[PDB]
Amino acid sequence: SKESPANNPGLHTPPDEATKGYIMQQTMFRIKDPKRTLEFYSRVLGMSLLNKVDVPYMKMTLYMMGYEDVSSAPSDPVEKTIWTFGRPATMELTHFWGTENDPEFKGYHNGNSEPIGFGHIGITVDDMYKACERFESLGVEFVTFIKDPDGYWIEIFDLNGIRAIVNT
Amino acid sequence: SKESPANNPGLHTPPDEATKGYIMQQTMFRIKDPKRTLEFYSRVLGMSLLNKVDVPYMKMTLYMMGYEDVSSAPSDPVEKTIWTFGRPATMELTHFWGTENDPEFKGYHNGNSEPIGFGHIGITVDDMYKACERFESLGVEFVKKPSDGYTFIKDPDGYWIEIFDLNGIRAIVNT
Numbered sequence: 001s002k003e004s005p006a007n008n009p010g011l012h013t014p015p016d017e018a019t020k021g022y023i024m025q026q027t028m029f030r031i032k033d034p035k036r037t038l039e040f041y042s043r044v045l046g047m048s049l050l051n052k053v054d055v056p057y058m059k060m061t062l063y064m065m066g067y068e069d070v071s072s073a074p075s076d077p078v079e080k081t082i083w084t085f086g087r088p089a090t091m092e093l094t095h096f097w098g099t100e101n102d103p104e105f106k107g108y109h110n111g112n113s114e115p116i117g118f119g120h121i122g123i124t125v126d127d128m129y130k131a132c133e134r135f136e137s138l139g140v141e142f143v144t145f146i147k148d149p150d151g152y153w154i155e156i157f158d159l160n161g162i163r164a165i166v167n168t
Numbered sequence: 169s170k171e172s173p174a175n176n177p178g179l180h181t182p183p184d185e186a187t188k189g190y191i192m193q194q195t196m197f198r199i200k201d202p203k204r205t206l207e208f209y210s211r212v213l214g215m216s217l218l219n220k221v222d223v224p225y226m227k228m229t230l231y232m233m234g235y236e237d238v239s240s241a242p243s244d245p246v247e248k249t250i251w252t253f254g255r256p257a258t259m260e261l262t263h264f265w266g267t268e269n270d271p272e273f274k275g276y277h278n279g280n281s282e283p284i285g286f287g288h289i290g291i292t293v294d295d296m297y298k299a300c301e302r303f304e305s306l307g308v309e310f311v312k313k314p315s316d317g318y319t320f321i322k323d324p325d326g327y328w329i330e331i332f333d334l335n336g337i338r339a340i341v342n343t
């Protein structure tokens with residue numbers, strides 16, 4: 001296959017046994033205002049607030065977001081946090097206190113203009129027509145990419161659209 | 169709880185029906201050199217190569233990587249791509265042809281120096297101290313000391329990758 005080590009210099013297979021059980025747990029973005037951020041990730045994207053971790057000594061709050069049923073999460077706060085950090089595919093949205101009130105705060109950089117680096121996260125939806133119609137109805141900002149309230153890029157795709165691209 | 173909508177202005181919960189089954193599928197980084205990036209994510213982190221997509225009209229290759237048994241994936245290349253895009257928690261590592269040789273390539277920006285923005289990805293390991301001894305053995309660069317229950321290592325482009333175990337998290341939270 002085109003994914004084989006012979007076709008991909010540097011690819012190491014099989015994974016070392018010491019790594020088995022590692023999970024890709026989070027992607028962290030710095031965010032200006034938790035009110036706008038919470039509304040975007042929870043209302044527009046459908047994620048749940050898995051955990052809010054205030055870190056007073058660092059003047060910051062971590063909002064852990066993801067696609068989970070929090071009605072069945074552990075009720076004990078410590079065990080709910082441990083549960084959160086066992087879940088793959090979360091967002092860590094970091095609010096440094098005061099950015100939302102500082103008239104000199106210049107904004108966070110999204111990686112897609114110089115200096116370039118970070119690209120985007122991407123969400124698999126059921127149907128790109130339905131998803132985009134609904135985003136328009138909610139007043140979402142479009143760059144297929146939408147933008148969160150700090151300007152980070154969020155790619156949207158469905159499996160039928162992927163199949164059509166791969167087939168050309 | 170401290171995650172309640174009453175305690176968190178802007179929180180819209182539970183999710184809208186239309187978002188049923190949405191998944192957080194990928195985190196995309198631009199990478200200078202696919203051989204270095206494949207070795208880091210596959211050897212150091214233990215990710216697999218789920219899919220390689222050459223896009224010749226954009227002079228780029230997409231390397232999709234994550235924690236999966238790729239021996240379980242479809243053999244049909246089209247179906248294997250579709251399988252990839254139904255897996256949560258992947259990396260999309262984007263190689264623009266020529267950055268690996270260009271003598272004036274300035275590097276990719278990791279978000280943690282001005283102008284700041286993007287932070288990191290993070291990996292839950294079995295045992296931070298065990299993981300870090302092994303990272304050391306593989307010549308991995310560290311951003312901070314393994315202490316206070318977390319560290320960051322750097323990928324070949326300089327992106328930060330947090331490392332923690334659940335005992336580390338529990339210790340942090342209990343303070």
Ligand code: NI
Binds near residue numbers: 196
């Ligand atoms: Ni993408």
Ligand code: NI
Binds near residue numbers: 026028092288290330
């Ligand atoms: Ni983190």
